[PDB]
Amino acid sequence: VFLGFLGAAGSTMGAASMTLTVQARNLLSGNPDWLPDMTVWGIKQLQARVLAVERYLRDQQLLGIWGCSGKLICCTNVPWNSSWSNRNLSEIWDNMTWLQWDKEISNYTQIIYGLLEESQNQQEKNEQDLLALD
């Protein structure tokens, strides 16, 4: 079910996974037209919509250095750790929200980005170069 923009903010992570392209399509282009030339009030909103794409491309950069690169669901080769969220499957995706998930991972989330940028493409790419000549 759609329910529009951010409609599944309190639903399950499996049901909210069914609304990924809706939250994405409305974050980048909230296009305001600035054809009128008004001096000092443009530099505040233009700085805002320039920092918007600076924050956007920072996520695309993190979504580029990882083996994941399609702007969709994507799988990696880094194993899940039992210390992170000591829970089984379907306890998460059918009784948890993305907010409460990010809250429990916020303690351990900072190292996961490093485990996705070094443990893979510093070695996966190196293995791809050392396994394609044959």
Added chain:
Amino acid sequence: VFLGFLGAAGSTMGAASMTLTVQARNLLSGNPDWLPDMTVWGIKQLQARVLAVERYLRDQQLLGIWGCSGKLICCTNVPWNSSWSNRNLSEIWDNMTWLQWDKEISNYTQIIYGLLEESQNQQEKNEQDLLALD
């Protein structure tokens, strides 16, 4: 044949398909250097070249939410509808321009974007997650 930028605007869609990378390379970087610090005349042209990448990334976002993501020719899994352009093959690609094509689709084009953003990656991704565990 090349014929430079926009050289195949009146040619066939098959011949113009042979000049995709030429129209792309000259739309993003028309780089003007703004090292001189002139007060009020920069905010108009800088707003122009900021809205340029805002319009550019809007297309990349639409070219990201779809199964298509390579900045090239790309195929999907949505079938063509006989109500859209009641014409056979080679009647299009050898006697039609991209302008006249966009004109006839302009009546039916708005739903095709929805058929490419929901009928696929809301389901293709979901099927990819439910068909990769084996």
Added chain:
Amino acid sequence: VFLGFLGAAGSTMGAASMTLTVQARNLLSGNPDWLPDMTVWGIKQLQARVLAVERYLRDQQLLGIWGCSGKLICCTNVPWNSSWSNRNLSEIWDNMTWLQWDKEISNYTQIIYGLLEESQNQQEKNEQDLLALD
């Protein structure tokens, strides 16, 4: 070995190839916060960080028109020319820096970009369209 940002500027190209994601992660987001509203000194630094993403997306465009598109190591189908760097393997990757490499290619580098944007995706894509119907 890491050695941080630009740590392998004088190392071998094979050892520096082990630090690609480090040089990439720190070039795009050097995020300065511009919440304070100061009139004339913002337009100089904001123009700088707008030309930063204009130069960034120009590389992504060149990294998009080529068969290479993953922001990683990537291989093509254009053969190496003996006129470019008359050297064997392991003479480069174990006794040369990326700076000295770009210096020797600077004489012949301008045509390589053309050989990667036309000799491939003007023909590789066309062959992909003419070899997928079966």
Added chain:
Amino acid sequence: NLWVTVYYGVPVWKDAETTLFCASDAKAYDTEKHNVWATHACVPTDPNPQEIHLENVTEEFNMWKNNMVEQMHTDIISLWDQSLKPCVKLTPLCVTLQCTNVTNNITDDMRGELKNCSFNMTTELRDKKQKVYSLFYRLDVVQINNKEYRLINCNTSAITQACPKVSFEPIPIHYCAPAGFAILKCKDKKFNGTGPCPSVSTVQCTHGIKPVVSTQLLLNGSLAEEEVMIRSENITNNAKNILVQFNTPVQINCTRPNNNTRKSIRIGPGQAFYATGDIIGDIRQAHCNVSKATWNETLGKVVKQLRKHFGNNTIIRFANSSGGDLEVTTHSFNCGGEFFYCNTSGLFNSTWISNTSVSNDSITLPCRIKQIINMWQRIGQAMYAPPIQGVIRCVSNITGLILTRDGGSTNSTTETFRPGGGDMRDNWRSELYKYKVVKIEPLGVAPTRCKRR
């Protein structure tokens, strides 16, 4: 068995503060007043306001730590200065003014204070100078010692005249969220201001807000939902103000009865100063009418909402203001161009029994008028209000109050709620209490079973 998987586009937000937009409201081209408040730069409103309710969502709001109020406060101030920047300056008006009381002091028990001032003003040319007259009005020096006068506006700051082409009629301005961010809108009828909102929706552009500069009485504001709200940053602490929102709008009618006229005397090569001409017709003081039955009912409805914090079956009082600044002690606002400074002492004489209080079709309020305002927090400038040619009458809804509690050991005795104000940010919290700005963080990680290569 299970591996980490990234998900791009998850509904995850973190509260932050960033620059917001502003809306044109779309009738701006048909206004053609050359410049309204923010018609200058704001962009038109979307055809359909994307108001999406988020089910199962409880979000913690806090209107008193909000950064949207600081933005609208800094937008209004920068709106004042940029509006008065290209207009006519009146620094040569700081001269000596030999003035005279108005010719009609009839029954000096009643008051009459307009000063038929004449002075040597500079002219079109620089060689000669001409003598003009008729600045008028109560705000003035007493002189140093026909009696001499000068401007005490000149005793503080420089003076510039407001452009006569622009207007002060508030255009509905609703702030808008930029790309990548969102605005969360509380929706339950009763809301403390501080606490979790169980019914939250999201929008980009907010609902239409009229920038109204008013003290002691909130005007043309948004009505509450079903019950009168008593909001405060800290109810126990006395110094913190008590914002009130009304359920039923209190009708108020203000009039400047003096059928007035203007004079365009020429000063300098391009400038032109507008002076208050001789009053045509009879004269009497400006006033504001509030129906006594509606105000009696509104007080009888607010007193019950106030007893919930201060005691069931107890008495509360509220007298008039204490004293101090004229903009603080008086219900100051604008209408048509003139700036009414009415005294609300005729409204706040009340003590309350647990069932009643301790005809007269209406309650009238005396009101003085002022044209030179030092309301600007930059004390380097002051604005001269141009005279309005004709009679002025404007109606309005009263939706709010700003009250201060008398401190001390008044527990066993009664409490007193004198009116107050001063800080402009309190005028905005009655409209931005239900709004919070959040930034979107769509990068999420979650374990599923899948394998690459």
Added chain:
Amino acid sequence: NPQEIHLENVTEEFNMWKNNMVEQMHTDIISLWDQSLKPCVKLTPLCV
């Protein structure tokens, strides 16, 4: 080198009287006058 590329087989409908390029150069020349005369010498005491 001015990149002047002719587009064969192309007929484009032009209208010089509804053009917005004229409005831009009109608003550029006026803003050019004011910014050029802004820091110069004022002669208001010459009105004698």
Added chain:
Amino acid sequence: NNKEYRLINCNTSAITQACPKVSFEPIPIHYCAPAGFA
């Protein structure tokens, strides 16, 4: 009403002198299209 005179420029608007260092000789100015347009 040697006869007196004044400026009728002063009868309309303020006056400012043109900078003597700048010139009014027109430099060839051709407009240019930004990125993404033609």
Added chain:
Amino acid sequence: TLQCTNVTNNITDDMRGELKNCSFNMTTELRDKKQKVYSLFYRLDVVQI
């Protein structure tokens, strides 16, 4: 125009003393009247005409 005066202490004019007790008609708060003030001082100045 500033009618000035050497400082009152030139003691031993072999050593130098150069601060000018200047007084002048400055404009005031109002535009009608003008007041006379003093004490600009210091070596940087004209010699007059």
